[PDB]
């Protein structure tokens, strides 16, 4: 008769407070340090990847971002760390970060034509192109907004309105063109003193252009500060401008409002399927804790910065 | 002789890491699950339980909030979660969230009349009424501020400087009327291009009306955007205007400056006395932990989002 225990052919080790590198018998490692290194689907939904493109490049459709004209239902948006085709004409979309926040809860857009090109009878919708936004070696401009140059040497006040009779919210995009001098204004827009006045139930906005001498970004000394709103059902947007108006052409009806994220990752898209996606790669594991990265869309393990977490479920 | 332990014919249970339900002897519960379920006093001070109203409906005195024209000392302010009587005339208020934040440290106002109606020789004070702010069916407008329209076919410039001779900080409110078109500036006032210049030792404002079209909110299209300041003792507030001036007539003097909160709940007012208030029901207990709600005003238990939080202060 005896009292005792067993060991095994085990080399795995745990750490305690009072002693480190302690051998264990049949322990469970809760830290997943392995990833496939590729981007795959999330629960069978193909994500919206952006190759040298941005949210400002996609929503205001860049001519070099024409891969995303008709986007199906996604689950997260992948962007690269420094995308080259991002506001090819200089400027800054106002509340760009808040807009990227509001695209972290949207899984699908329907790009609808709320304002066609035929709905500008008194303005020029064809010459609004630039060499800073090229396409196939030719001048071009964004495809989801029209740069309205004067027609017949005249730019009247626009006073366009759109009532949202659709039962979903609409994301409406426009902008103001900050030129360099008054000569460029008089060349493009017949009225010297211009404004844009946006009115709806909640949002009130007046935009007087800031005509100033500026340096060269992307080849031209001009800026187009873009703006956005969300128009509710049975709510009407009212744009009024006698100049410098980058008018909307397409809107993005929000039909699937759920959960998503923006990853900012430069990983090539693989072809597999799993539940948890990380910017570096994918996890297909039911471990409690992952050290791979902080941001993990979907049902995932919890981020712990440590490199070795082995709960000792063994004698020694 | 023998050795052993007590048993007490009890069924109460405690939680351990390695086992979930263990029968226990003399366990002391630390979690206060229960509450009386109604709002009442803190140390004898009747709270400011404004009903179907908001902070902006109270400070700018809504015609539908008439019960609080002279508010006694309060320990906290309660507003319902979705109030209806608030900004009856469509509008907004800049730093409204900061105004609620600074009101959360104020326990008493003394409503003083800083500007009388006799201090408007050349401006109408009785025609400033609205149909979107009803009072016994008839049109009305906020009591505290007067929406000065022209008198005698013109709007003489309003150069009024008020000196704070009191020994307390004064909360002073005013606003600007962003009209919906220029014909209402021709009719309500006289000058088309108007400004509101507000000067303080620590504040500069040059508000201008945004005169474009907006949609219907509450039956009307104009937007009154309100503003506030806090004036120090021996500090002077200076108002200069030639139009769109929502001029002050009443101001609030900060007499007691302590601890309060802007609580959001719709529970009716009950009659009790306690030390802590939680929005769904007042806690009258000395336990270390409560699950009732995160926001609690007074000497209260710490909030822990859990169930069955009981320490085993006994054996078994």
């Amino acid at each position, epitope marked *: 008769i005896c009292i005792g225990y067993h060991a095994n052919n085990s080399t795995e080790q745990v750490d305690t407070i009072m002693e480190k590198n302690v051998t264990v018998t049949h322990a469970q490692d809760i830290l997943e340090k392995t990833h496939n290194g590729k981007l795959c689907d999330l629960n069978g939904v193909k994500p919206l990847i952006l190759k040298d493109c941005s949210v400002a490049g996609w929503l205001l459709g860049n001519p070099m971002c024409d891969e995303f004209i008709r986007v199906p239902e996604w689950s997260y948006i992948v962007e690269r760390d420094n995308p080259a085709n991002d506001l090819c004409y200089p400027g800054s979309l106002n509340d760009y970060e808040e807009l990227k926040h509001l695209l972290s809860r949207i899984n699908h857009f329907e790009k609808i034509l709320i304002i066609p090109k035929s709905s500008w009878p008194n303005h020029e919708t064809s010459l609004g192109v630039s060499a800073a936004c090229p396409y196939q070696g030719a001048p071009s401009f964004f495809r989801n907004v029209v740069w309205l140059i004067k027609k017949d040497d005249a730019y009247p006040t626009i*006073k366009i309105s*759109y*009532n949202n009779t659709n039962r979903e919210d609409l994301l409406i995009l426009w902008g103001i063109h900050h030129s360099n001098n008054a000569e460029e204004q008089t060349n493009l827009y017949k009225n010297p003193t211009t404004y844009i006045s946006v009115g709806t139930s909640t949002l009130n906005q007046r935009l007087v252009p800031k005509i100033a001498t500026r340096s060269q970004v992307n080849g031209q000394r001009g800026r187009m500060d873009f703006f956005w709103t969300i128009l509710k059902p049975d709510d009407a947007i009212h744009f009024e401008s006698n100049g410098n108006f980058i008018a909307p052409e397409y809107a993005y009806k929000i039909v699937k409002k759920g959960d998503s994220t923006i990853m900012k990752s430069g990983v090539e898209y693989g072809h597999c399927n799993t539940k948890c996606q990380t910017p570096v790669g994918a996890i297909n594991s039911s471990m409690p804790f992952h050290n791979i990265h902080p941001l993990t869309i979907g049902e995932c393990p919890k981020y712990v910065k440590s490199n070795k977490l082995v709960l000792a479920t063994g004698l020694r | 002789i023998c050795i052993g332990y007590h048993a007490n014919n009890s069924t109460e249970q405690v939680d351990t890491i390695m086992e979930k339900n263990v029968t226990v002897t003399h366990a002391q519960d630390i979690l206060e699950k229960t509450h009386n379920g109604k709002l009442c006093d803190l140390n004898g001070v009747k709270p400011l339980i404004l009903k179907d109203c908001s902070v902006a409906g109270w400070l700018l005195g809504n015609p539908m909030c008439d019960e609080f024209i002279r508010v006694p000392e309060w320990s906290y302010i309660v507003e319902r979660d979705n109030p209806a009587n608030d900004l009856c005339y469509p509008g907004s208020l800049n730093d409204y969230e900061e105004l609620k934040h600074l009101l959360s440290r104020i326990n008493h106002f003394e409503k003083i009349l800083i500007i009388p109606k006799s201090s408007w020789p050349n401006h109408e004070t009785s025609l400033g009424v609205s149909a979107a702010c009803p009072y016994q069916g008839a049109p009305s407008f906020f009591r505290n501020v007067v929406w000065l329209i022209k008198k005698d076919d013109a709007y003489p410039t309003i150069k009024i400087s008020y000196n704070n001779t009191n020994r307390e900080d004064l909360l002073i409110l005013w606003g600007i009327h962003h009209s919906n078109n220029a014909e209402e500036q021709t009719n309500l006032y006289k000058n088309p291009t108007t400004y509101i210049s507000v000067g303080t030792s620590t504040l500069n404002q040059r508000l201008v009306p945004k005169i474009a079209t907006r949609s219907q909110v509450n039956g009307q299209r104009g937007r009154m955007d309100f503003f506030w300041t806090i004036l120090k003792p021996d500090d002077a507030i200076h108002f200069e205007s030639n139009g769109n001036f929502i001029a002050p007539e009443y101001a609030y003097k900060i007499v007691k400056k302590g601890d309060s909160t802007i609580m959001k709940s719709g529970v009716e007012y009950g009659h009790c006395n306690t030390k802590c208030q939680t929005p769904v029901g007042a806690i009258n207990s000395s336990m270390p932990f409560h699950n009732i709600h995160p926001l609690t005003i007074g000497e209260c238990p710490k909030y822990v989002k859990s169930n069955k939080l009981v320490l085993a202060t006994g054996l078994r």
Partner: antibody
Amino acid sequence: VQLQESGPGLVKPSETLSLTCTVSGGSISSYYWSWIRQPPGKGLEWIGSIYYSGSTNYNPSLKSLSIISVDTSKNQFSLKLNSVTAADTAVYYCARELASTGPLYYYYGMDVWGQGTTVTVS
Amino acid sequence: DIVMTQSPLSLPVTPGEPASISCRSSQSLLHSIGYTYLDWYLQKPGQSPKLLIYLGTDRAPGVPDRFSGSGSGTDFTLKISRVEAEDVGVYYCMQALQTPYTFGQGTKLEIK
């Protein structure tokens, strides 16, 4: 974009006038196409308005078997006024209303007006 | 239906002096959007109607800035500051609010 009204020039009371207007130098799409009558010295009267897809709107004040007609393939819209009774003598105008009365509520007016046409009903 | 009335019928105006043409009718001539729906049409003798000021107080392409308009609700006002001998016509005022569009009586302008 210009509009050219082609007219009969006279009609006896029993029959229906055949007054067409053809869009030359432009497109028929995405604009309201409306007929406006002008009797001699009695102002201007709006006969009707046809959106290209459909949704014909007549004038309640007078009903004269109005059949405003539209055809895109030929870039043409046409007017017929049967049951005429010699009160319809008019220097008719076709006009291109530049407005949308649906979700897009832009209204820019009747910019383009035809050269005109004359009809003295006898 | 909506019936308008020209308050002036003929305006002998010295060139270089602003004029005033006004018309009104029953309803408030403001659609759900809120942009006052009115137009003024010149209809020069021999020519055809031209938009001039539209949607209440906004000017057409090509028309010089001497034309302007104002008003909301029932009351309206056309005004041609520094009028010129090119500006002859009738200035019909059309209510564009509802389906049965109607016109004014016309203001035939004679050069003084």
